[PDB]
Design a protein around this ligand. Sequence first.
Ligand code: 8NP
Length: 109
Amino acid sequence: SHMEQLKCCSGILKEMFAKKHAAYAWPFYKPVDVEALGLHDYCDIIKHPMDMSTIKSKLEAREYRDAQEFGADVRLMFSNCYKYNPPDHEVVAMARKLQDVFEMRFAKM
Ligand SMILES: Cc1cc(-c2ccccc2Oc2ccccc2)c[nH]c1=O
């Protein structure tokens, strides 16, 4: 059921925002500040930005038909991080820790 699975998606996102994962999830909470120092080329490289607060808003506005569409936006958020940053960047390691949480929950739902 699409309704039941979207409720599960809201539960996954709630865990990603939880204190348990806060040490590595915090860079993903809000949209990337493209006006910040070092991010002058972000919009040239990242054509479709995504963050957890935007996904929470899309869930609330019924913008996902099913769990696969919610999953696509979570993976877009991580892929943007892996595309923009150098592979040894601190934020890439944080993205992998949070993607581990997401993938385990998304697979078992
Ligand atoms: C998804 C994402 C997020 C951020 C980012 C967002 C808010 C504040 C600081 C931030 O930078 C950090 C740099 C090192 C470690 C952690 C964060 C920067 N770059 C990205 O690609």
